[PDB]
Structures are given as C-alpha cells and as structure tokens.
Amino acid sequence: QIQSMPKVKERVSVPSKDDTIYSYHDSIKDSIKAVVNISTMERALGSGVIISKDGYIVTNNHVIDGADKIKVTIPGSNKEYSATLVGTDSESDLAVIRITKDNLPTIKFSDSNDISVGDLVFAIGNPFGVGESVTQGIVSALNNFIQTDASINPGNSGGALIDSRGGLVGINTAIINHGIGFAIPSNMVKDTVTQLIKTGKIERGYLGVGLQDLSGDLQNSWDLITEVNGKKVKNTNELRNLIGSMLPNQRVTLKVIRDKKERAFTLT
C-alpha cells in the first residue's frame, strides 16, 4: 500500500532564451558593498559587515582575537582604514570595531525568527580586500545557530549571511567537513552589537544558584554564595538571568526555603 506521486508531465527550467541568463546578482548587488575585509593583502584575517552609517562593523570574535592593529578595506576605493575595537563577546563569537568614515554602505537586519528551512541564502565575504566572494545555499536547520549548505569557510567567516532580499539573516562563522556551515542568527547579532557599543561588553546577570531538572523526584508536578536547587527546564532560567542584565528586579516561585527550591519561569 505504497502511496505514489503522479506522473511527471511538464518540466520547468530557467529562461530557455538564447538572449538571457539566470542570476542572483541583482538580489545581492547591494549587500556586497557592506561586507569589508579585515587585516592587520598577503596575510588577511576574516571578513566583516558594516552595520552603521557612521562606521560600526561586525565580525567574529575569533577573527580578530590576537591582533594589535586592525585595518579594513571597503568594496571600491581600495583605501585601508584604521579600525578600533569596541567590544568582544567570547561566548557569542561576536566583536564590534569602528572606522572613521561616514555615509558607508550599511546592511539591513532581517528577523532571524521568521526564516524557515529551505530559504534561499547567500554567504558574502571579503577574504582578501580585492573583491567579493559569494556562495549560494539554503537554510538547512534551525534552532541559536543557523545551518546552511552554503560554503562557510575562513574566507566567509565574519561575513554576511543574507536572504534573497539582501537582508542580513546571520553572520558567518567558520569552525574547524560535511559541507554544512554555521551562522550566528541576526537577532542575536543585533542584541549583542548594541550592548557591545553601549556598555563596551556583554553584561549577563547572576543569581547564585545551581540548577537541575526533575525526572523521577517530581513533587507536585540567597545570592552572595551558594545553592543547589531545581527548576522546570533548568536551561531557560539561565537564559532568563543572563538576559536580566545586571541589577534589575527579581521574581521567583515557591518550594520551601532557600536551598532545595524550585523556580517556575513565567513573568517579571
């Protein structure tokens, strides 16, 4: 009782005209001018993406980690610009640098929470400060990390992962084959580079409790030093406090008193 698809009658291709070609260039022509080279070119190091008109740039933390005099190159011109480090998140592998230039081509952020697997994406990078380097693929898997069968390599690392509108869906990140690459989603990139520009680094948030998940001991279902308590899904509470951002307000849930407590995640 094997179900089967109907017989294939027609076959649709790209324009069969002897006069026209099929290309993705118009969809990517603009975003390429916002992807820059990053050097200290014979010996370069990673790519970067302009995110502000006044000269703010995003790259991977591993791209810049170790250098002393960061220089960038923009599509066109060919002039080199002195770049100064603004922030560096080690966990997120994100860093922000700045150059002294105005009216730069910037990239527009796409909402990485509205993408689906199968979406057409392009990995743009400027590996050696002479031209672009685009690779084509699709969104392979979703969540925290975007998997794509587009070539994500050290040349593309720190570069732009865009959709078919040219909008930034993520920042490429080359890690150590399988033909599958990774990219830091744009929503995460958006939140990180604001905190790095404003405060200079990423401020987390800390309660002072060790968490664990219930599995067999399901019952009815301070700050300065130590604690070992439980909670529902002991993975969302660490993300809610790391996003709590230093000295806010606190809410919690009941169990008993202090240690061996249970925190229920909900509102503010």
Binding site: E203, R204, D223, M246, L247
Partner: peptide
C-alpha cells in the same frame, strides 16, 4: 560573570 556576576550581577544581582
């Protein structure tokens, strides 16, 4: 790495 710490806060309140």
């Amino acid at each position: 790495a710490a806060a309140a």
